[PDB]
UniProtKB/Swiss-Prot annotation, chain A:
Protein name: Large ribosomal subunit protein eL15
GO molecular function ontology, one term from the record: structural constituent of ribosome
Disordered as annotated region, ranges: 154-203
Lineage start: Eukaryota, Metazoa, Ecdysozoa, Nematoda, Chromadorea
Keywords annotated in UniProt: Ribonucleoprotein, Ribosomal protein
Xref: Pfam families: Ribosomal_L15e
Gene source species: Caenorhabditis elegans
PROSITE patterns cross-referenced by the UniProt entry: RIBOSOMAL_L15E
Gene it is expressed from: rpl-15
Swiss-Prot record, chain B:
Residues of the whole record sequence present: 68 to 199 of 265
Entry keyword Calcium: no
Bilayer-spanning residue ranges: none
The protein's assembly and partners: Interacts with cmd-1 in the presence of Ca(2+).
Lineage of the species this protein comes from: Eukaryota, Metazoa, Ecdysozoa, Nematoda, Chromadorea
Protein name: Large ribosomal subunit protein eL8
Family: Belongs to the eukaryotic ribosomal protein eL8 family.
Gene that this polypeptide is encoded by: rpl-7A
Curated annotation (Swiss-Prot), chain C:
PROSITE patterns, alphabetized: RIBOSOMAL_L13E
Database matches in InterPro entries: Ribosomal_eL13, Ribosomal_eL13_CS
Molecular-function GO term, any one: RNA binding
Pfam families linked: Ribosomal_L13e
Localization terms from the record: Cytoplasm
Reported function: Component of the ribosome, a large ribonucleoprotein complex responsible for the synthesis of proteins in the cell. The small ribosomal subunit (SSU) binds messenger RNAs (mRNAs) and translates the encoded message by selecting cognate aminoacyl-transfer RNA (tRNA) molecules. The large subunit (LSU) contains the ribosomal catalytic site termed the peptidyl transferase center (PTC), which catalyzes the formation of peptide bonds, thereby polymerizing the amino acids delivered by tRNAs into a polypeptide chain.
Main localization (coarse): cytoplasm
Protein name per UniProt: Large ribosomal subunit protein eL13
Organism (species): Caenorhabditis elegans
Single biological process term from Gene Ontology: translation
Keywords in alphabetical order: Cytoplasm, Ribonucleoprotein, Ribosomal protein
Family to which this protein belongs: Belongs to the eukaryotic ribosomal protein eL13 family.
From Swiss-Prot, chain D:
GO molecular function: structural constituent of ribosome
Record PTM N-acetylserine, positions in chain: 2
Protein name from the UniProt record: Large ribosomal subunit protein eL36
Chief subcellular location: cytoplasm
Subunit structure of this chain's protein: Component of the large ribosomal subunit.
InterPro entries with a match to the protein in the record: Ribosomal_eL36, Ribosomal_eL36_sf
Keyword field: Acetylation, Cytoplasm, Ribonucleoprotein, Ribosomal protein
Organism: Caenorhabditis elegans
Cellular component, GO annotation: cytosolic large ribosomal subunit
Length: 203, 121, 204, 104
RNA sequence: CUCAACCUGAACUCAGUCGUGAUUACCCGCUGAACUUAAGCAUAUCAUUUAGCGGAGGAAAAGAAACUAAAAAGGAUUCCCUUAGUAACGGCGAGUGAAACGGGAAGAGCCCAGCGCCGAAUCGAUCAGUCUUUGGCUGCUUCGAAAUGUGGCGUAUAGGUGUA
RNA sequence: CGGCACUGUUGGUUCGCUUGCUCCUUGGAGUCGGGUUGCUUGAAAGUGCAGCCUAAAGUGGGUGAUAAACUUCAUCUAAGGC
RNA sequence: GACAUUGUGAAGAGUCAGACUCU
């Protein structure tokens, strides 16, 4: 099908053709607002494999995120502590730029539900993602028994709780000994379990 | 944006879409295509109640549909719109058609082609 | 200030442990709640076994435990085929299917095939519509003795048997067990060096 | 080997409790990785369309000059791993051979 | 230059929706100290913790292996006992510190993209009938979404064609 | 007020399912991986997370807890979802 | 200072064997 060809073509981001297209598109994106509604996905096949359907109730937004580390917000780099906490500059955020972009889209659009997002462009200053969202109250969504899951209260603001694909990557979930720190579904839960003092009834 | 697309150097595989069928050849192509337009809304209305009381040749559309036809060498002629945006949707067709020896031309107007098919684009 | 002969202290109480304390005063309450849940489930799914699906037999993984068997997650598709049970049919008649496990040894496959066979022998199938039975469904007076089963389905026996006394054979005595063990250890340990020597000899 | 005094060995090259082996059949999940014919056609056509990346072009120049070690080091630095560097170098060497045969 | 498409972007007290703000015991994502211990103190410790910000539910999160392991092998997630104050980390100082196997509670499995086939077979509003009407069912109702592809089969246990 | 079980009725729906043979077919990219920086872990020539640079392949990719080549294998199938 | 953002042409010098490097 054509979708396989689109996927393979998009895999070649250093080719002349895709470099030209990305240059044009990045220039265009830099002139718009930070969060901006998009008429249609820029990468229909990527959106499809992330879960998008060309059906009423699915919407696409483009979010621009500033690149680089996260400077510690202190006055004149004054931390007032031991030297181990003096770092101000080479400090990296715990969440990825994609996760931050999904968070911005979700915060702005409170009545929709963030489904996913994908990379569309980047320059030295910005990274551009497109977030696919769903309107949980459109009947085209509520009557389809396959998208009904996202219309339930337990999925409110998934990006603010780190449940989207981009969000989960930062939580360190997985199987095996490499991911044993998050047994129970979260590092905080596992830490609580390991650091609770247990007093059995008969001891 | 229009100015930038001319100012920058365009790679050949992107530039091939700028040179489209000339006016006369395009008119001939559309004249041929208009003979096999899909079923109209009024035709559907009139046929529905007759069938309730009781598939010719047609132009096929859609990249995935056209891509399969080309790979199976079942299509005789393929017309590709020149203003497809995003362009990656049809970036492969000119080379794919030429690889399977299927005649193809980049005709002007995804909206003109959509009219032939009773669609938007 | 420890004084005299003492074991050096090790108590891990230097954190704010008073914020994370778990007591077990609700242990009998939890026991009662789980018994009540089992009773409710039994009423809900009677006459099906309260335990639920039938589980498979499994050898414990490591050599420290490989002489013991235990209940597994389910039956492999190879075992289901050997017992002549479809996976779809097993899901309906209440047999656990382990879609990840595969059998690499005839003895392991056969044990579970026999387990499936005895479960089928002990099974009682009610007619899909009480008015009209069909083929495979159990007989009328069989459906009267039906009773809910409690505990594991086909529980495993852990009794240990002792081999019968026998005669000490001469060939048994003439074997050098310690020399054999040390020879095996040496052969495994020096296998690679001998291969290197053989390759060098061939090259010369 | 089983016999007088031996019912199985817990150590050595022939250790293991005796058991009968069933014939081995590949699991379905193992099939992932094989290129389909259509996928190979797609990849070759997309290569023809898009072309080469800048580091690929540099490696092609090195291979034309026959600096295999320099190409390997460059690909190790860029791609990162010896395995991947070897794979990419072999593919680009095939490209060079095909170009030579086609043109000259 | 006329008319008509599409694309992109607007304005509407246009028709009908939805979000905001509370609560803290538990839950999810971030941000993030110092007192204190080291008989001083800077790494370390306190602590991936007070404090700060955001987001849900009756539970949440996790969850159906890019797993454990190296047996004659186990087989989603969650929780308990044990492993164990162990392997390991640490001015190798003060201190810190898991997991698998094993015994149990409970146990339930699945859906896409892609490939391929049917190919718009799919869907929202509106109108008219009809019912058990705080919502459903029927359409030559009229509009619109959808070929930059909605629906059907189908997802690693594979799947599909024909055939018995 | 609920939960059931059986009867009737109303509306929708069912060319399917299993096993053998036959032929065909079969997959997620600025992602993985690599360098470096910072945090974090019991994880020790890097356990997890992230910034920047680099940037894939297709029996390929990951993993097998001491780094690297060359070898025996074993085990899964990441970058989508309930 | 290096890398990325960073594109399109000329002249000189130097490497190679039409590319690269600089200015």
């Amino acid at each position: 099908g054509a979708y396989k060809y689109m996927q393979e073509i998009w895999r070649k981001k250093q080719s002349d053709a895709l470099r030209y297209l990305l240059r044009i598109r990045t220039w265009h994106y830099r002139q718009l607002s930070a969060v901006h509604r998009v008429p249609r996905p820029t990468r229909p096949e990527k959106a499809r494999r992330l879960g998008y359907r060309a059906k009423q109730g699915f919407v696409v937004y483009r979010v621009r995120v500033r690149r680089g580390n996260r400077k510690r917000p202190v006055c004149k780099g004054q931390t007032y502590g031991k030297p181990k906490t003096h770092g101000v500059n080479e400090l990296k955020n715990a969440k990825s730029k994609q996760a931050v972009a999904e968070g911005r889209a979700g915060r702005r659009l409170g009545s929709l539900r963030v489904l996913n997002s994908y990379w569309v462009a980047e320059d030295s200053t910005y990274k551009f993602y497109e977030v696919v969202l769903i309107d949980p109250f459109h009947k085209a969504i509520r009557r389809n028994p396959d998208t009904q899951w996202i219309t339930k209260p337990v999925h409110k603001h998934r990006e603010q709780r780190g449940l989207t694909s981009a969000g989960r990557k930062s939580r360190g979930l997985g199987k095996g000994w490499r991911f044993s720190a998050t047994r129970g579904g979260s590092q905080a839960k596992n830490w609580k379990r390991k650091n609770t003092k247990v007093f059995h009834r008969k001891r | 944006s229009a100015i930038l697309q001319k100012r920058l150097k365009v790679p050949p595989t992107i530039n091939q879409f700028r040179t489209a069928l000339d006016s006369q050849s395009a008119r001939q192509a559309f004249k041929l295509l208009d003979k096999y337009r899909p079923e109209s809304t009024e035709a559907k209305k009139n046929r529905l109640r007759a069938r309730a009381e009781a598939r010719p040749n047609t132009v096929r559309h859609g990249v995935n549909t056209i891509t399969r036809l080309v790979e199976t060498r079942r299509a005789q002629l393929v017309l590709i719109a020149h203003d497809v945006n995003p362009l990656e949707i049809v970036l492969h067709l000119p080379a794919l058609c030429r690889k399977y020896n299927v005649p193809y031309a980049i005709i002007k107007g995804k909206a003109s082609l959509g009219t032939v098919v009773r669609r938007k684009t | 200030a420890p004084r005299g002969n003492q074991m050096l202290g090790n108590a891990h109480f230097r954190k704010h442990w008073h914020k994370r304390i778990k007591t077990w005063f609700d242990q009998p309450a939890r026991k009662l709640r789980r018994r009540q849940n089992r009773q409710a489930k039994a009423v809900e799914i009677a006459p099906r076994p309260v335990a639920g699906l039938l589980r498979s037999v499994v050898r414990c993984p490591q050599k420290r435990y490989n002489t013991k068997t235990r209940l597994g997650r389910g039956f492999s598709l190879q075992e289901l085929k050997a017992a002549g049970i479809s996976q779809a049919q097993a899901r309906t008649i209440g047999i656990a299917v382990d879609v990840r496990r595969t059998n690499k040894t005839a003895e392991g496959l056969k044990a579970n095939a026999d387990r499936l066979k005895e479960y089928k022998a002990k099974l009682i199938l009610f007619p899909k519509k009480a008015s009209a039975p069909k083929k495979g469904d159990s007989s009328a007076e069989e459906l009267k003795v039906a009773a809910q089963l409690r505990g594991d389905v086909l529980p495993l026996s852990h009794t240990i048997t002792f081999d019968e006394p026998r005669q000490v054979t001469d060939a048994e005595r003439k074997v050098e067990i310690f020399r054999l063990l040390r020879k095996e250890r040496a052969d495994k340990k020096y296998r690679g060096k001998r291969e290197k020597r053989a390759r060098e000899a061939a090259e010369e | 080997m089983s016999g007088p005094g031996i019912e199985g060995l817990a150590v050595g090259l022939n250790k293991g409790h005796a058991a009968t082996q069933l014939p081995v059949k590949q699991r379905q999940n193992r099939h992932k990785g094989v290129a389909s014919k259509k996928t190979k056609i797609v990849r070759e056509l997309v290569r023809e369309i898009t072309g080469f990346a800048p580091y690929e072009r540099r490696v092609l120049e090195m291979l034309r000059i026959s600096k295999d070690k320099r190409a390997l080091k460059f690909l190790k630095r860029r791609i990162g791993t010896h395995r991947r560097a070897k794979g990419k170098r072999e593919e680009l060497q095939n490209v060079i051979i095909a170009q030579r045969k086609a043109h000259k």
